[PDB]
UniProtKB/Swiss-Prot annotation, chain A:
Subunit structure as annotated in this protein's UniProt entry: Part of the 50S ribosomal subunit. Forms a cluster with proteins L14 and L19.
Coverage span on the entire protein: 1 to 229 of 287
Organism in which the protein naturally occurs: Mycoplasma pneumoniae (strain ATCC 29342 / M129 / Subtype 1) (Mycoplasmoides pneumoniae)
Family indicated by similarity: Belongs to the universal ribosomal protein uL3 family.
Domain of life: Bacteria
Gene Ontology MF annotations: rRNA binding; structural constituent of ribosome
Keywords: Ribonucleoprotein, Ribosomal protein, RNA-binding, rRNA-binding
GO CC annotations on file: cytosolic large ribosomal subunit
GO biological process, one term: translation
Protein's UniProt name: Large ribosomal subunit protein uL3
Function: One of the primary rRNA binding proteins, it binds directly near the 3'-end of the 23S rRNA, where it nucleates assembly of the 50S subunit.
From Swiss-Prot, chain B:
Record gene name: rpmF
Name of the protein this chain belongs to: Large ribosomal subunit protein bL32
Keywords: Ribonucleoprotein, Ribosomal protein
Family: Belongs to the bacterial ribosomal protein bL32 family.
GO CC, alphabetical: large ribosomal subunit
Lineage per the UniProt record: Bacteria, Bacillati, Mycoplasmatota, Mycoplasmoidales, Mycoplasmoidaceae
Species whose genome carries this gene: Mycoplasma pneumoniae (strain ATCC 29342 / M129 / Subtype 1) (Mycoplasmoides pneumoniae)
HAMAP family linked: Ribosomal_bL32
UniProt cross-references to InterPro entries, sorted A to Z: Ribosomal_bL32 (IPR002677), Ribosomal_bL32_bact (IPR044957), Ribosomal_zn-bd (IPR011332)
Pfam families: Ribosomal_L32p
Swiss-Prot record, chain C:
SUPFAM superfamilies assigned to the protein according to its UniProt record, in alphabetical order: Translation proteins SH3-like domain (SSF50104)
GO biological process, one term: translation
Swiss-Prot/TrEMBL keywords: Ribonucleoprotein, Ribosomal protein
Pfam families in the record: Ribosomal_L19
Family that this chain belongs to: Belongs to the bacterial ribosomal protein bL19 family.
PANTHER family associated with the record: LARGE RIBOSOMAL SUBUNIT PROTEIN BL19M, RIBOSOMAL PROTEIN L19
Gene encoding the protein: rplS
General function of this protein: This protein is located at the 30S-50S ribosomal subunit interface and may play a role in the structure and function of the aminoacyl-tRNA binding site.
Protein name: Large ribosomal subunit protein bL19
GO CC annotation: cytosolic large ribosomal subunit
InterPro entries, per the entry: Ribosomal_bL19 (IPR001857), Ribosomal_bL19_CS (IPR018257), Ribosomal_bL19_sf (IPR038657), Translation_prot_SH3-like_sf (IPR008991)
GO molecular function terms listed in the Swiss-Prot or TrEMBL record: structural constituent of ribosome
Higher taxonomy: Bacteria, Bacillati, Mycoplasmatota, Mycoplasmoidales, Mycoplasmoidaceae
Keyword Transferase applies: no
Organism of derivation: Mycoplasma pneumoniae (strain ATCC 29342 / M129 / Subtype 1) (Mycoplasmoides pneumoniae)
From Swiss-Prot, chain E:
NCBIfam families reported for this sequence: rplN_bact
Organism: Mycoplasma pneumoniae (strain ATCC 29342 / M129 / Subtype 1)
Keyword RNA-binding: yes
Protein's name according to its UniProt entry: Large ribosomal subunit protein uL14
Complexes and interactors: Part of the 50S ribosomal subunit. Forms a cluster with proteins L3 and L19. In the 70S ribosome, L14 and L19 interact and together make contacts with the 16S rRNA in bridges B5 and B8.
HAMAP family, A to Z: Ribosomal_uL14
Family label: Belongs to the universal ribosomal protein uL14 family.
Role played: Binds to 23S rRNA. Forms part of two intersubunit bridges in the 70S ribosome.
UniProt keyword terms in alphabetical order: Ribonucleoprotein, Ribosomal protein, RNA-binding, rRNA-binding
Disulfide bonds: none
GO biological process assignments: translation
PANTHER family: 50S/60S RIBOSOMAL PROTEIN L14/L23 (PTHR11761), LARGE RIBOSOMAL SUBUNIT PROTEIN UL14M (PTHR11761:SF3)
Single GO MF descriptor: large ribosomal subunit rRNA binding
Length: 229, 56, 115, 119, 122
RNA sequence: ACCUCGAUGUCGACUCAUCUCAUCCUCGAGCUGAAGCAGGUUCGAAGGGUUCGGCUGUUCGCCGAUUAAAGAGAUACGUGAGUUGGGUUCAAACCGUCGUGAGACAGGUUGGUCCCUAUCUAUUGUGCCCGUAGGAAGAUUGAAGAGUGUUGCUUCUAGUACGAGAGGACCGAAGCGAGGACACCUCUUAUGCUCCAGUUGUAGCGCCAGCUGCACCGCUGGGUAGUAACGUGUCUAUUAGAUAAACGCUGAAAGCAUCUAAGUGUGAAACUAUCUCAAAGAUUAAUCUUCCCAUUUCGCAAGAAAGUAAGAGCCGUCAAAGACGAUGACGUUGAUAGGUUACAGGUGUAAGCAUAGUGAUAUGUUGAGCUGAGUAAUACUAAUUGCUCGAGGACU
RNA sequence: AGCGAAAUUCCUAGUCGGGUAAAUUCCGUCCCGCUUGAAUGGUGUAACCAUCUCUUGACUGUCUCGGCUAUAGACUCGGUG
RNA sequence: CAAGGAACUCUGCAAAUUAACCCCGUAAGUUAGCGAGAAGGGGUGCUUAUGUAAAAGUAAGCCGCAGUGAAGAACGAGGGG
């Protein structure tokens, strides 16, 4: 449809107390008004999207090709540039307030790059189960199980493509939906969202409109303190 | 498990192609005539051009 | 711009209480919870002794333990959470900010008080 | 595994750290593996920071971080430090010592480095 | 952290002391049990003068967990024992006296006859 | 009675599962000796899933309990160059029998050794050179696929229809779920070994106190960042098209009639999408944008010779990276890492002084003291007074 | 005579009671016992077994359900190989 | 290492559980020797004093979360062959 997109950095993860006697763990995402760097059009580029530029840096340092383009475009130097589909409701070189994109209590989805786990194990990469260690069942216990399916030149004769095996874990741009918008901060351009944000602190996080519950908007009330001496 | 058939000279050389090494680093030291590699001390008793030790 | 992580505390300045009754792990207290029944927010007074008090700003919670019907029961309560009214009747004298042994050393329910 | 070398665990490393900070306080220059200097720099800077005050509690605290040598004893090293080295570095916020990368060792080509200090 | 064949106590006015879980209802491999769950139990320790005898297959509801469990609010109630009441195939129990308060974490599931005779509704 | 016995190692147990349908449930349709409910029946139908415990070496099999169900086969009676040999099939020993005798039992009985430094392909991740056609830097379309397509209970409609009476739905809606996968360590845990606290002796610091070497980090209680789940959030919905079986309208041959022949539809947990991954070595070599310049002047066809004004690489600091590689940031105008300072937070009233007690000990000093990784300012230190590749657009 | 599904019993996982929610194993019993049986000995038999088996209190990462701390490797660097 | 606690499994293999000293109590069987550390409980510290050749032990006060505070210390019972 017209899914909007905003960027931020996961600067913290705490709990925020909501009404009806419920504790809501909350990730804190520091944001900033992004600048439009490109506007793909259904006619000009066979698809309409927005190449948003974000993570602003000093004019002192930037890629001189890209920085020369930025001055030629008269824009400001930012570190990252990424595209978002269907977000074509504004113009070039424009700062965006998250207030104009989403409500304080509606439902959204969040894409992020997962934390790097390096050389993981298939027991943890695929979340498998290891049987008993008693009765002296040999030294090896953490392995991929039986890789044998068939043998001889008649049944399988090989390992098949698409086999669950270990390797590098994390560093994958994934998306998780149905995360409640909870709090806004226009004074410092920051958001307070429910759920557990993928990746470690300081990573780049994109927030988009909910894909399957966009029109579903139910605000979350704040548990005001009964503080009274 | 064990090797079944012996390899060939060309194949083993192609395998060893990754055993080749790259070029090292080389910087210039002015007061002491020497081409010492970068972020290292100078044998004339200095690091870079700053004198810190004995000339050895 | 560079992050500070003090903003984590800054965004939490809207759900704080100014009563801030300081206590210790081993204090003889009563915590009353203002819990709605369906209507009728009732005041459930949970008396007992403090066991642990640790956290980070808003995350600071505590454990209160008593004995009801001969059954020792302990429950966690969060400080900044609303509906929580805390009263302390005797400030104890505990050498540590945590008493794990008190889970089993239930003998001598009266504790030494500070001066 | 069964009977083999006992390893070089963190306890051995920190013991060597105490030995080497004692040595560098005795002399003022130590040439050794770079990695060990990288770890011992923090502890040496902390000891220097604690050496400015010269209070009996702080003396007792640093008592736990020296050793016995031939050039000077633990008391001799401590009094020499607290006498002359303490006011030497009282004007700079850290960075009292510098590690400079030397040439590789002859034996295992370990990257050698020298820890030194001066005003 | 209660599962199948977890020898658990009973704190109601009956003639048994220890029973054993045989199946925790739910999807296959539940393997966990917490407050408010309804389980099938085999009697393993019962006096001969009680209302029920050893080895009888019956239905129980666990009301105490030494590990405890977390309330939706955020107040984790932790017990020091693992006890359960016995029901007569409905929302009503079979004991006639409750020994110890019963929490509100399982009130929403129903079973109000048990909570009506509870020592205290936590 | 065979390619194989100059060797294709098995029964089972654990792990890995996959595919298929002669479908078990979940999906749909039709008939009934289908009042309802519960059904039986035949097919389309392979997306997901289909239990636990006792005994047997036993797979199997029997029994009990539970869900909607505890389906069936194949892959060398799959699965040791993934673990075990419980049985089984070395001698050893007995029981019952047989042979007179060595012994044997397709009888039981007790234990009774499972080798491997990975060459290649396939296969899971990550790099090196080149290509992608002047060089460099970003953003892409999508060529191709892959993951994923579980599902129960309660309530309302409603004890309503139906049914006479007991009994008792269908449709839809809401809530509660479980399970597995994804994500994080703020709530509960542990771990957290150069963090804190209490505490033991021994050998010493000459001695008292206080300390360190040793004792699993000496023991014990924890714990900063972090790590993991047993901690908490999401996910399974909904929907379009082609639709299978199936239900159809008109409508002939066959003047009736007919879902099919032309035309016109509905309709499946399956399929093409919509959820997620990913990407032009997609040689199918693509697209868009940006920057660099043509430093007089040659060669078998143009820059022998100044190889960039752009960038990258070598080297160092490192982390949100991270076996190495490689990723990203910083490289003196640098807060990138360390240190200083302060703070958060954790541990928990430090040493010592004074008072009381013969001594242990109690109180004030003191929530003091300390604190690897949490936060901020700080060039104080380390990132250099450095080097290399690196442009004239080969051609339509 | 004695013992008698036993180190013996194919049928057999024989029956029975206990055991066990649920036990082709176990305990005693039933005596037509395939092929038991009295120094190629038979039955009770005290104690004992690095003897075998079953149950039981406690006990635990055997398991439920795996994870972290340090090393020696596994990885890298230099020498050798 | 939070909880369960043999449920995994041919079977508690292994591991954990028990330990050393002093004080209570210890049964069946028994061939009188054993069983017996049976089965099971309490304490082990600091200071003063009572205490002896030395203690052990006891009284008062002192707390730690815990006082063979570290070290090394049988798990046990029943049935059957």
């Amino acid at each position: 449809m017209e899914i909007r997109g905003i960027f931020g950095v996961k600067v913290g993860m705490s709990q925020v107390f909501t009404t009806n006697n419920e504790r809501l763990p909350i990730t804190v995402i520091y944001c900033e008004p992004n600048q439009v760097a490109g506007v793909k059009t259904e006619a000009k580029d066979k698809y309409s999207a927005t190449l948003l530029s974000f993570d602003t840096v000093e004019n002192k340092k930037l890629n001189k090709p890209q920085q020369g383009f930025f001055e030629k475009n008269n824009l400001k130097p930012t570190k990252h540039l990424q595209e978002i589909r269907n977000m074509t409701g504004f113009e070039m070189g424009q700062q965006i307030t998250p207030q104009n994109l989403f409500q304080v209590g509606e439902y959204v989805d969040v894409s992020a790059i997962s934390k790097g786990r390096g050389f993981t194990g298939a027991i943890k990469r695929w979340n498998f189960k290891i049987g008993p260690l008693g009765h002296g069942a040999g030294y090896p216990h953490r392995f991929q199980g039986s890789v044998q399916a068939g043998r001889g030149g008649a049944s399988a004769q090989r390992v098949f493509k698409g086999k669950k095996m270990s390797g590098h874990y994390g560093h994958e741009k994934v998306t998780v939906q149905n995360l409640r918008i909870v709090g806004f901060d226009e004074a410092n351009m920051l958001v307070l969202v429910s759920g557990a944000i993928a990746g470690p602190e300081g990573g780049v996080v994109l927030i988009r409109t909910a894909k399957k519950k966009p029109g579903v908007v139910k605000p979350i009330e704040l548990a005001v303190q009964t503080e009274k001496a | 498990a064990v090797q079944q058939r012996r390899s060939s000279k060309h194949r083993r050389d192609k395998r060893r192609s990754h055993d080749a090494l790259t070029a090292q680093a080389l910087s210039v030291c002015q007061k002491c005539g020497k081409k010492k590699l970068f972020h290292r001390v100078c044998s004339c008793g200095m690091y870079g051009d700053l004198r810190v030790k004995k000339a050895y | 711009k560079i992050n500070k992580q003090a903003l984590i505390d800054l965004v939490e300045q809207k759900q704080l209480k100014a009563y801030v009754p300081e206590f210790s792990a081993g204090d003889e207290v009563n915590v009353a919870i203002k819990l709605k029944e369906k209507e009728k927010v009732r005041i459930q007074n949970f008396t007992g002794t403090v066991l642990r008090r640790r956290g980070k700003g808003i995350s600071e919670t505590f454990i209160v333990r008593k004995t009801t019907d001969g059954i020792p029961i302990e429950k966690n309560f969060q400080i900044h959470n609303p509906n929580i009214s805390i009263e302390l009747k005797r400030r104890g004298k505990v050498r540590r900010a945590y008493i794990s042994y008190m889970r089993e050393r239930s003998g001598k329910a009266a504790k030494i008080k500070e001066r | 595994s069964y009977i083999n070398k006992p390893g070089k665990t963190s306890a051995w490393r920190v013991m060597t750290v105490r030995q080497q900070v004692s040595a560098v306080l005795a002399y003022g220059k130590i040439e050794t593996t770079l990695k060990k200097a990288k770890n011992t720099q923090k502890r040496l800077d902390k000891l220097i920071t604690l050496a400015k005050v010269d209070n009996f509690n702080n003396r007792r605290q640093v008592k736990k971080w020296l050793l016995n040598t031939n050039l000077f004893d633990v008391d001799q090293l401590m009094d020499h430090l607290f006498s002359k080295v303490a006011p030497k570095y009282e004007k700079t916020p850290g960075g009292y010592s510098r590690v400079l990368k030397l040439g590789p060792r002859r034996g295992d080509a370990t990257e050698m480095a020298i820890l030194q200090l001066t005003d | 952290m209660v599962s199948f064949m977890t020898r658990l106590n009973v704190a109601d006015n009956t003639g048994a002391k220890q029973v054993g879980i045989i199946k925790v209802l739910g999807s296959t491999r539940k393997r966990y049990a917490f407050l408010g769950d309804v389980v099938v139990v085999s009697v393993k320790d019962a006096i001969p003068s009680g209302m029920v005898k050893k080895g009888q297959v019956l239905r129980a509801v666990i009301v105490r967990t030494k590990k405890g469990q977390q309330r939706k609010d955020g107040t984790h109630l932790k017990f020091d024992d693992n006890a359960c009441v016995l029901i007569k195939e409905d929302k009503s129990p079979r004991g006639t006296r409750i020994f110890g308060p019963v929490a509100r974490e399982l009130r929403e599931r129903g079973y109000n006859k048990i909570l009506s005779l509870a020592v205290e509704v936590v």
